[PDB]
């Protein structure tokens, strides 16, 4: 009947700003998935981030058109624009518009975007497009702060008539995996070992992500306080 | 699977020779109390107990890892038997 046991030790394994592994053991029976699932849900849906929500390109009507002088189609450019990782230096800032104008033979990278105050580009070596001789690319991209994943048709934002709405990938967290393995402390054989695996884009580290995630949860627990 | 089993099988012309080598080597480790090991202090196979990581008691695990290092010589008619025995007894008493 008598039950008294020690609080679990939190173990951390981190490689760069991209990836981390988080081990929590021992836990009481079942608590491995009790902690793991909500955190996974929060980590994917609710973690604050940035995304490209809209794109305008000169002489381009719709998304499925092509660009004379450029090999990639408008589709492929928008894809690369989704992989763009933008970090806002200031909390006040909500939305930005980044302009890119280039021509001649060139391979356009994310670094080529004209710098904005308190806006950092985490992946400057990301390849947006290649331009040929006579190839002309003039474009403006709409970058917003939000959470989770919003398809293009859901926000549907347009600054002008030719602006193409882009699926907004807000989540700095790319993937969350967790697994519970049986572990034993002394004669207690049903105990849980929680392991979390988090992939981010580097804008927010996995440890930062997990910390933000557990805070959101705790704050939601305070909502049962005053009826 | 045993770690690096494919390379181990790669080392011999017959898998059963790998077995004979590993076994004899492990018996050598047991007889001399792992004093004859070719593994550096940080290559030592570890077992996790309640207190902390200690030396893996298992001589076969050892023998296989040693074999993987390449620091072991195997073959037929390397040394007369009792000479090998006595020399290992000299270098590593029991």
């Amino acid at each position: 009947l008598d039950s008294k046991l020690k609080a679990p030790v939190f173990t951390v394994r981190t490689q760069g700003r991209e990836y981390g592994e988080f081990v929590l053991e021992p836990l009481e029976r079942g608590f491995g998935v009790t902690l793991g699932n909500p955190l996974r849900r929060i980590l994917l849906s609710s973690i604050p981030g940035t995304a490209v929500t809209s794109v305008y390109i000169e002489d381009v009507l719709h998304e499925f058109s092509t660009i004379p002088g450029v090999k990639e189609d408008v589709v492929e450019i928008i894809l690369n624009l989704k992989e763009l990782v933008v970090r806002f230096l200031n909390p006040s800032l909500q939305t930005v518009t980044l302009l890119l104008k280039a021509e001649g033979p060139k391979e356009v990278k994310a670094r080529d975007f004209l710098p904005v105050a308190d806006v950092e580009i985490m992946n400057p070596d990301l390849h947006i497009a290649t331009l040929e001789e006579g190839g002309r690319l003039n474009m403006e991209v709409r970058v917003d702060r939000g959470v989770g994943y919003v398809p293009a048709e859901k926000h549907g934002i347009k600054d002008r008539i030719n602006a193409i709405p882009v699926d907004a990938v807000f989540s700095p967290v790319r993937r969350v995996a967790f697994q519970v393995e049986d572990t034993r402390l002394g004669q207690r054989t049903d105990l849980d070992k929680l392991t979390l695996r988090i992939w981010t884009d580097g804008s927010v580290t996995p440890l930062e992500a997990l910390n933000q995630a557990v805070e959101i949860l705790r704050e939601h627990l305070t909502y049962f306080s005053n009826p | 699977a045993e770690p690096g089993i494919d390379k181990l099988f790669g080392m011999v012309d017959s898998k059963y020779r790998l077995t004979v080598v590993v076994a004899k080597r492990a018996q050598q480790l047991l007889r001399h109390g792992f004093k004859n090991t070719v593994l550096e202090p940080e290559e030592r196979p570890k077992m996790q107990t309640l207190e902390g990581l200690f030396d893996d008691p298992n001589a076969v695990t050892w023998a296989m890892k040693e074999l993987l290092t390449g620091r072991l010589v195997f073959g037929e008619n390397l040394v007369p038997e009792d000479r090998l025995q006595k020399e290992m007894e000299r270098l590593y008493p029991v």
């Binding site: 029976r29 079942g30 998935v33 699932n37 | 059963y16 076994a23 018996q27 047991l30 007889r31």
Partner: protein, 1112 residues
């Protein structure tokens, strides 16, 4: 709760008494209630009449017999390890022919086992069952000759151990041959012995031209009946002097002697019906007025020739036909052994008659009862048909008594058993269940008596039908044999009826087993019920028509293995047979007449009837069965309750309110779960353990003896050398563990000391002795301890001692002590669960309740069954059972769904609709709408085409619910299962195969005497067998050292195993193997065969494996 029953078929007659096959048989054999002068010539009376009179001039004759009352009641016999039996006295009279002196006395022949009320026996305290045997009915058969087509064999078969089979065959050389005791001789010779003139045989057999010419031999007719007789005697007995009276003796004993040669009454009847004749006696001939007269032989020869010729009205015989196969029940078998023992007693009688003094001989001096006693005892102990009764649950006993076996004495051996006899013959219909048989080597050889089936006085299985005249079905019920059934057109039991008249233009019937569509004018008879086709077990499987036969077999067999549960419940879906089984099995206690309940106790129920008499019923409480299952009766009534006749007073084991309860009704979801239900494994909720579902009581009996030895007496005492008070804690003053104590492996049940074997202490022992200054005790600790893996609470102690009143043990035994230990077994991982449809699985995982899939209302499922077990198995009955089970869950009702007259999909759909309203409308009123998860699942199901698009969420959820599917939430996530899952109530049983009984391990232990190999079996603390095939596995792996260890270090290499153990406790690697002892045993056993086996080296020089110990 309400019990709703389906089906339109009204059964005209109830099931016959299910144990009658045992009871009426044995009662018929004993004739104990019949006053001696009114007894018939059947039974043990028959055996007396065959044995006596005993002649050769003294003559011992038999007047009558009597059976006394049993010296002890059944219970007392069970406890004292006695046999429930009655003393058998026989009134005999010795008559000296010359003197005329008649001495008459009643002699005591010993005891005969009495059958209990339920149709079982008590032999040495253990309950046994004599299983009915099936065999070829005696008579005259005609079978196709397998070698030569156009020719046939005529076989004359008597009862077993009743004399020789006789074959008649037309030889390629044209003459008719007779085979007796493997002797082929011309039949015409025996024909001449019977006194047949060539003229009579010519006029009789003349109608068949070619054959009778082959019958004609003039060298035989030139002889006389005497000369022919002596000729035949010289043919059957080479070297034996051909004396006339000796030849007469031999031939009489071979053919006409009723005591040596016996066709059964059935053999008599069948011979008569087949050969179209009338038999005087039960033999093939007679000795009348000094000569022999023929009975069977000539009609047999006539029929054989007629069949060979092609004459109409002559056919071969189907030996597997159930008209040609009969049953020997308890009475016949016991009577047979009685006849044998009696014959031996007679031999002894003739001995004493010749040897004893001529002036005074009483029947008491002439009769030694011992051989008879031995015969009976042998039958009830070492016979293959005498089996340890299966009491696991009441249905197990009931089913065991109804078993039929083709094996045993006078029966088949599994080698001689081919596909034909194991087949389901068409004639098994209504007689022998097509379903319930063992899966393995005994398949088709061990079968079960059908529910409505009855064995007639001749031993043939009969099934009921109903007379149909002019399309009108009467209530007249007729039991026919298969032969009689073959004569009619019999309609199916489901043929539509309005009143007593059949209304269909076309009806489905059987003619000689052949399915045929006939008009009502053609219907002679009609089945009583689908129930009659199957056994009592198979009849307990609802929706049987939806299950493949192969799994029905498994469900049937497994119901026998169901363990009585403390909380046991009747199935939510029953077949309607659940109460009759409880009643007939004598499991439950019932009210004798209409009355009022006076007293209710755990131990007792006292009832006052209309007679004003007070009748007290003791309840059997926590008694141990043969299988160790607890059999106990609980009162189901209360003080002051009025009870009518046949009312339930008390529930026995596996009975819930008079309904058979073999298991629990649990809430199942059919889905895969994380591989834990992979390959028939089953996942259960810990909630089942919490509420004590599938918990069963088991009682184990331990026994120890203290005996007189030559080294001094063993004694049962509390004084045990070298033992602390911690070990003697629970031992009473006398040394026996006290009732109520908890025992674990290693604990002493009974203290015992034994005087040490004579030994001179080794110098080590002597020095240690002097060092510690303690005298070596002359007794050692032999005490009985709790074996590994066992334990419980001690509920009983029995102590019997020499010198105690009413107690006498076997010679040399001072005292015997028994200890009964009870244990409450919760369901655990590795325990076997099964349903009635053949779905079996071992529990692989027990999840906490929060991990369980649950309904949107927060209700967790009990059991998770993998759907992958359904399609290949083809038992859909369990699915239907689940669906209906779902309905009855929310309606709170149970169902009776008779086999083949069932609940049908639409009806289950209606019930499911009502149930859905109960399951949902409640929510709608509670102020909750449709859940988001429910919406997602509805979208999914809408893509699967499960629900119609455009309907409201409620409409769609109802659409699913009618398919027996519901939305289910993962307890670990909270997200719903993507598809809707089948969920409902299923009846699942805990089988007698329990991992607690089967788990065994050994490092070292006892070894065999000669071979020095480990003993086998858990009880002996034995090692696992590594057999030829395991050896082949190791060889195939090329693992030489593992194998060599198996062959030497771990088994019979003495030095090797010792040195290995010591090496391991020391921490050294194991030493090199030596010669396995059994090889030395081989060498020495070959030497005893006068063969010299020499182990040699490469120099061909001898090597001594016995190390000089075998050489002088």
């Amino acid at each position: 709760m309400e019990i709703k029953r389906f089906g339109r078929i009204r059964e005209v007659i109830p099931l016959p008494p299910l144990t009658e096959i045992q009871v009426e048989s044995y009662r018929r054999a004993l004739q104990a209630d019949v006053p001696p002068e009114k007894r018939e010539n059947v039974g043990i009376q028959a055996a007396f009449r065959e044995t006596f009179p005993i002649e050769e001039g003294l003559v011992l004759d038999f007047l009558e017999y009597r059976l006394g009352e049993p010296p002890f009641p059944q219970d007392e016999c069970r406890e004292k390890d006695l046999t429930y039996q009655a003393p058998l006295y026989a009134r005999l009279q010795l008559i000296h022919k010359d003197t005329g002196l008649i001495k008459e006395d009643e002699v005591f022949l010993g005891h005969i086992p009495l059958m209990t009320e339920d149709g079982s026996f008590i032999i040495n305290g253990a309950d046994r069952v004599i299983v009915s045997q099936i065999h070829r009915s005696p008579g005259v058969y005609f079978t196709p000759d397998p070698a030569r087509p156009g020719r046939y064999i005529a076989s004359i078969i008597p009862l077993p151990k009743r004399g020789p089979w006789i074959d008649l065959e037309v030889e390629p050389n044209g003459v008719v041959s007779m085979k007796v005791n493997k002797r082929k001789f011309p039949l015409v010779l025996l024909l001449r012995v019977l006194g047949y003139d060539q003229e009579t045989l010519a006029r009789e057999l003349g109608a068949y031209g070619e054959l009778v010419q082959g019958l004609m031999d003039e060298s035989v007719f030139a002889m006389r009946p005497e000369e022919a007789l002596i000729r035949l005697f010289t043919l059957l007995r080479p070297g034996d002097p051909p004396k006339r009276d000796k030849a007469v003796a031999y031939v009489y004993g071979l053919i006409a002697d009723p005591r040596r040669y016996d066709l059964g009454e059935a053999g008599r009847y069948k011979a008569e019906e087949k050969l179209g004749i009338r038999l005087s006696g039960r033999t093939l001939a007679r000795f009348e007025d000094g000569e022999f007269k023929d009975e069977v032989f000539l009609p047999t020869l006539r029929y054989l020739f007629a069949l060979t010729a092609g004459v109409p009205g002559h056919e071969v015989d189907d030996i597997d036909h159930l008209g040609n196969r009969r049953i020997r029940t308890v009475g016949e078998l016991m009577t047979d052994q009685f006849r044998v023992g009696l014959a031996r007693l007679a031999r002894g009688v003739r001995e004493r008659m010749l040897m004893g003094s001529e002036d005074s001989l009483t029947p008491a001096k002439l009769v030694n009862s011992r051989p008879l006693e031995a015969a009976i005892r042998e039958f009830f102990s070492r016979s293959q048909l005498s089996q340890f009764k299966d009491e696991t649950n009441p249905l197990s006993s009931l089913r065991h008594k109804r078993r039929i076996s083709a094996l045993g004495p006078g029966g088949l051996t599994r080698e001689r058993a081919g596909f034909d006899v194991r087949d389901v013959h068409r004639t098994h219909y209504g007689r022998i269940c097509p379903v319930e048989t063992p899966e393995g080597a005994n398949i088709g050889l061990i079968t079960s008596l059908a529910a409505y089936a009855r064995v007639d006085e001749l031993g043939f299985i009969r099934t009921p039908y109903r007379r149909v005249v002019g399309g009108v079905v009467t209530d007249e019920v007729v039991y026919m044999t298969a032969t009689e059934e073959d004569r009619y057109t019999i309609a199916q039991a489901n043929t539509p009826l309005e009143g007593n008249r059949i209304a269909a233009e076309r009806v489905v019937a059987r003619r000689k087993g052949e399915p045929v569509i006939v008009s009502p004018e053609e219907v002679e008879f009609m089945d009583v019920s689908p129930k009659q086709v199957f056994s009592v077990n198979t009849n307990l499987i609802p929706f049987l028509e939806h299950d493949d036969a192969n799994r029905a077999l498994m469900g049937s067999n497994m119901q026998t293995q169901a363990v009585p549960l403390i909380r046991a419940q009747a199935p939510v879906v029953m077949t309607g047979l659940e109460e009759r089984v409880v009643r007939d099995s004598l499991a439950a206690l019932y009210a004798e007449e209409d009355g009022e309940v006076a007293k209710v106790d755990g131990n007792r129920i006292v009832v006052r009837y209309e007679d004003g008499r007070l009748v007290e019923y003791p309840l059997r409480r926590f008694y141990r069965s043969n299988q160790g299952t607890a059999l106990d009766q609980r009162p189901r009534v209360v003080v002051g309750q009025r009870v009518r006749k046949g009312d339930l007073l008390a529930d026995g084991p596996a009975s819930e309110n008079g309904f058979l309860a073999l298991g629990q009704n649990v809430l199942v979801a059919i889905m895969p779960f994380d591989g834990y239900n992979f390959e028939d494994a089953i996942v259960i909720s810990e909630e089942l353990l919490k509420r004590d579902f599938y918990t069963s009581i088991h009682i184990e009996r331990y026994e120890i003896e203290a005996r007189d030895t030559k080294l001094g007496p063993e004694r049962i005492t509390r004084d045990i050398p070298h033992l602390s008070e911690a070990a003697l804690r629970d031992l009473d003053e006398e040394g026996v563990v006290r009732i109520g104590a908890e025992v674990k492996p290693g604990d002493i049940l009974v203290g015992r000391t034994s005087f040490k074997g004579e030994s001179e202490p080794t110098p080590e022992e002597r020095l240690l002795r002097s060092i510690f200054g303690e005298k070596a005790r002359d007794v050692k600790d032999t005490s009985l301890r709790v074996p590994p893996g066992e334990g419980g609470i001690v509920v009983r102690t029995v102590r019997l001692r020499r010198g105690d009143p009413g107690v006498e043990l076997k010679p040399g035994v001072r005292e015997v002590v028994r200890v009964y230990v009870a244990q409450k077994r919760k369901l655990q991982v590795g325990d076997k669960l099964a349903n009635r449809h053949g779905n079996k699985g071992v529990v692989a995982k027990i999840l906490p309740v929060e991990d369980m899939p649950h309904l949107p209302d927060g209700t967790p499922v009990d059991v998770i069954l993998n759907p992958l077990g359904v399609p290949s198995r083809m038992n859909l009955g369990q699915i239907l059972e689940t669906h209906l089970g779902l309905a009855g869950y929310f309606l709170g009702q149970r169902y009776i769904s008779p086999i083949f007259d069932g609940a049908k999909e639409p009806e289950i759909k209606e019930l499911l609709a009502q149930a859905f309203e109960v399951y949902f409308g409640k929510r709608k009123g509670e102020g909750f709408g449709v859940d988001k998860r429910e919406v997602e699942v509805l979208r999914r199901a809408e893509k699967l085409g499960l629900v119609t698009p455009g309907k409201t969420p409620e409409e769609q959820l109802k659409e699913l619910f009618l398919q027996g599917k519901v939305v289910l939430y993962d307890g670990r996530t909270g997200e719903p299962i993507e598809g809707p899952i089948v969920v409902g109530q299923m009846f699942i049983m805990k089988l007698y195969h329990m991992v607690e009984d089967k788990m065994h391990a050994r490092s070292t232990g006892p070894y065999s005497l000669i071979t020095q190999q480990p003993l086998g079996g858990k009880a002996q603390f034995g090692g696992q067998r590594f057999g030829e095939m395991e050896v082949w596995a190791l060889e195939a792996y090329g693992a030489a050292h593992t194998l060599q260890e198996m062959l030497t270090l771990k088994s019979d290499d003495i030095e090797g195993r010792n040195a290995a153990y010591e090496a391991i406790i020391k921490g050294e690697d194991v030493p090199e193997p030596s010669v396995p002892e059994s090889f030395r045993v081989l060498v020495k056993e070959l030497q005893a065969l006068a063969l010299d086996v020499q182990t040699l080296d490469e120099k061909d020089n001898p090597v001594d494996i016995f190390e000089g110990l075998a050489s002088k």
